[PDB]
Amino acid sequence: ARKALIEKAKRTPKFKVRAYTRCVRCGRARSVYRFFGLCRICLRELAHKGQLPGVRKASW
């Protein structure tokens, strides 16, 4: 259960509460940020890549 499971995450019918978030780059169901549509893992990868517009290291 992983391939047929990233299917349902985009399928989204039948009751509105059965629909859930899901990382697009991966298939992660946990720690999925609504802002990017990505898991915390993928988000970190791309942020170091530079492929995340404006996204920058936080030092203060």
Partner RNA sequence: CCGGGCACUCUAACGGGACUGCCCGCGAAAGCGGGAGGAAGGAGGGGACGACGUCUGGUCAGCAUGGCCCUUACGGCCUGGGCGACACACGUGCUACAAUGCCCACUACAAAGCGAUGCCACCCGGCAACGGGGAGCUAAUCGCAAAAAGGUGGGCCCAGUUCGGAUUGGGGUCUGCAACCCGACCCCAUGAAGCCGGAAUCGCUAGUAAUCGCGGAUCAGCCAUGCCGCGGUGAAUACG
Partner RNA sequence: CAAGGAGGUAAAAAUGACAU
Where does residue 18 rank: exposed (0-12), middle (13-18), buried (19+ CB within 10 A)? exposed
Please report whether residue 5 would count as binding other proteins according to CB under 8 A: no
Tokens of residue 10, six digits: 């985009």
* Annotated binding-site residue? 23: yes
Please report whether residue 39 would count as binding Zn ion according to CB under 5 A: yes
List 24, 25, 47, 52, residue binding RNA (CB under 7 A): 25
Q: Are 46 and 38 in contact (CB under 8 A)?
A: yes
Q: Which residues line the annotated binding site for Zn(2+)?
A: 23, 26, 39, 42
Binding residues: 23, 26, 39, 42
